[PDB]
């Protein structure tokens, strides 16, 4: 048997948010938790929920699982509507990359022995600057796999080569002791709307005018800067036409900003004059 290079760990929206929150809720200590999910068949690992684990001093190791805690919370989740498995464990690496180091391989070996499909997800919450989420999923390579003359994981689809690995992980052996399974976040149509509500602008913000004093100051400043750019532009056009750009591009961006601001505020003003009387 082999693990295809199309396997994906579909991390749900709730799981991703919980992971990032727990990472920056305990940086620069490391944090750990379980990933309740579902092994669909052989190419899918669905991480439906994640599962914080109390900080226990011994970093993140096998002794940091606290069997009483996990058992009791799994029972309680079962009776509240989560009859889910334990597909792997996530554990943050606060700022020093997304890979594994020794104890991680030992712990993931424990999880695999429990069930040989459990992934291990690593999140770097400091490097997760807004606009880039650094999460990577991993699983081990059998000692009799790369030494017996077999590639770590077969390849039947062109899917597994659309993401390039990072040198940070290469150094620690992204391809000598463990894989890298793709993520492929799974978003419903309701979660996306509920999240859009985060920055959704109110009708008030749509229909509210801009402080006229500040608007006039902005008009004046932009028109002056545009005058300077226009003098430079005259000089540039004369010089280029004589001897045979930055002024033109800056002038274009500034004209854009002035026109958008003025038209928007003027139309808002008329709309209000009609709507509120």
């Amino acid at each position: 048997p082999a693990v295809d290079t199309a396997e994906q760990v579909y991390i749900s929206s709730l799981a991703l948010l919980k992971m990032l929150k727990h990472g920056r809720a305990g940086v620069p200590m490391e944090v750990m938790g379980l990933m309740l999910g579902e092994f669909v068949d052989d190419y899918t690992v669905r991480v439906i929920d994640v599962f914080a684990m109390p900080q226990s001093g011994t970093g993140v190791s096998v002794e940091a699982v606290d069997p009483v805690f996990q058992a009791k919370m799994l029972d309680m989740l079962k009776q509240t509507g989560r009859p889910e498995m334990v597909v792997g464990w996530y554990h943050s690496h606060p700022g020093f990359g997304c890979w594994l180091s020794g104890v991680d391989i030992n712990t993931q070996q424990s999880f695999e022995a429990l069930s040989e499909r459990a992934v291990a997800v690593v999140v770097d919450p400091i490097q997760s600057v807004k606009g880039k989420v650094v999460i990577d999923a991993f699983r081990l390579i059998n000692a009799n796999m790369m030494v017996l003359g077999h590639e770590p994981r077969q390849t039947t689809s062109n899917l597994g080569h659309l993401n390039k690995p990072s040198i940070q992980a290469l150094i620690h052996g992204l391809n000598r002791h463990y894989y890298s399974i793709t993520i492929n976040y799974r978003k419903n149509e309701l979660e996306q709307k509920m999240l859009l509500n985060l920055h959704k602008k109110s009708w008030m913000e749509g229909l509210t005018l801009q402080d006229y004093s500040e608007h006039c100051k902005h008009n004046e400043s932009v028109v002056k800067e545009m005058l300077e750019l226009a003098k430079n532009y005259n000089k540039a056009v004369e010089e280029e036409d004589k001897m045979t750009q930055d002024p033109k591009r800056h002038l274009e961006e500034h004209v854009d900003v002035l026109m958008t601001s003025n038209i928007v505020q003027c139309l808002a003003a008329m709309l209000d004059t009609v709507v509120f009387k």
Partner: protein, 172 residues
């Protein structure tokens, strides 16, 4: 009967969770699980609500839920799965089933096997079966046999978590 690869889900049923609401004390739940002609009777009305629980999630291919052939047999079988709480004969009459079988005498007979929509039963821990109507119309309903045919889903049985490698002191 049993296509290769699928096995009867008797061994994975734990009595810790099995129950059957509205059952006559004369004929108990143990009757439906012997393959003998020992039956289960309805107590008050022409309705019944069985519930079976499995140790590890299982996949259900077919059901052998059959009764006698004297007009006292299940007619409308509503199957729900994975119920957080034991339900009542009032929710059983409106809740949308995961399956809505309407048995016929052919299925009722000893050689009748009713196949379910396999896809909706890919992870089953608890099954509640509501018999809403009898084959004809009898104040008491009777069930002669009931067993599921399917496959078990590989279990990640926590509490088995142990050090398979290394010392007992590494932290990170």
């Amino acid at each position: 009967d049993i296509p290769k690869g699928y096995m009867d889900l008797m061994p994975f049923i734990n009595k810790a969770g099995c129950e059957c609401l509205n059952e006559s004390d004369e004929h108990g739940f143990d009757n439906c699980l012997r393959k003998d002609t020992t039956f289960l009777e309805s107590d008050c009305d022409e309705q019944l609500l069985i519930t079976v629980a499995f140790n590890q999630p299982v996949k259900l291919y077919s059901m052998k839920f059959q009764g006698p052939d004297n007009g006292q047999g299940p007619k409308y079988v509503k199957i729900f799965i994975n119920l957080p709480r034991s339900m009542d004969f009032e929710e059983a009459e409106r809740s949308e089933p995961t399956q809505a079988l309407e048995l016929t005498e052919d299925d009722i007979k000893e050689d009748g096997i009713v196949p379910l929509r396999y896809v909706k039963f890919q992870n089953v821990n608890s099954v509640t079966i509501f018999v809403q109507s009898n084959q004809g119309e009898e104040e008491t309903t009777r069930i002669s046999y009931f067993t599921f045919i399917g496959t078990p889903v590989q279990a990640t049985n926590m509490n088995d978590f142990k050090r398979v490698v290394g010392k007992k002191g590494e932290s990170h």
